[PDB]
């Protein structure tokens, strides 16, 4: 099965799609983020974020609170499953993570954690 997406990141504060299937045969699995607009990443940055469904809104949190040059991620988080760089117009950014980190049985979300554009870049990550 295939292991690998690209998820783009737009000028309207959208991923092109909010929900990712992991299929469990998978050992690793990649997202590659990508930002087909115009806006550089201060104006409209986005980044790619893994985490349980409860933990995500810490993660928001204290990522908006450590700001810009700390890519809107807390230091040291271990909420962060796996998670890209935060990336602005014609950027790109891949990660790749282990599907053993995957507890089967939590649920999973992704988010984007440029302040406020949550509020529309969040979705789910199925592990099937
Ligand atoms: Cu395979
Ligand atoms: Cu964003």
């Given at each position: 099965?295939?292991?690998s ?24 699995f ?11 990443k201060?104006v ?5 974020v ?17 700001g810009?040059d700390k ?19 014609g ?25 406020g554009h ?11």
């Amino acid at each position: 099965a295939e292991c690998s997406v690209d998820i783009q990141g737009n000028d309207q504060m959208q991923f092109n799609t909010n929900a990712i299937t992991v299929d469990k045969s998978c050992k690793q699995f990649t997202v590659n983020l990508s930002h087909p607009g115009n806006l550089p990443k201060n104006v409209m940055g986005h980044n790619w974020v893994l985490s349980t469904a409860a933990d995500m809104q810490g993660v928001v949190t204290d990522g908006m609170a450590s700001g810009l040059d700390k890519d809107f991620l807390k230091p040291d988080d271990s909420r962060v499953i796996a998670h890209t760089k935060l990336i602005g117009s014609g950027e790109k950014d891949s990660v790749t993570f282990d599907v053993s980190k995957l507890k089967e049985g939590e649920q999973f979300m992704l988010f984007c954690t440029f302040p406020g554009h949550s509020a529309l870049m969040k979705g789910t990550l199925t592990l099937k």
